Design goal:
By secondary structure, the chain is an all-beta fold. The chain is about 0% helix and about 50% strand. The protein is built from no helices and 5 strands. It has a 5-stranded antiparallel β-sheet, with no helix packed on it. Keywords: Activator, Cytoplasm, DNA-binding, Stress response, Transcription, Transcription regulation.
Length: about 70
């Protein structure tokens, strides 16, 4: 797919958001808990490999369809 891969830079489980460092060296991408493929998870750990799509974000590039790798 047109899915980018990256690593979770940080994730604040109390606020439900964080950033992803894309593997292409481009700007960090905002991730909202609601963008995560749920299955009774919806949380992310610093350093986790993820796959996502880059989407139209309210303030910058946002991750959509976030999957664990």
């Amino acid at each position: 797919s047109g899915k980018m891969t990256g690593i979770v830079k940080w994730f604040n489980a109390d606020k439900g958001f964080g950033f992803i460092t894309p593997d292409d060296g481009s700007k960090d991408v905002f991730v909202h808990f609601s963008a995560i493929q749920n299955d009774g998870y919806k949380s992310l750990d610093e350093g986790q490999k993820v796959s996502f799509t880059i989407e139209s974000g309210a303030k910058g590039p946002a991750a959509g369809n976030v999957t664990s790798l």
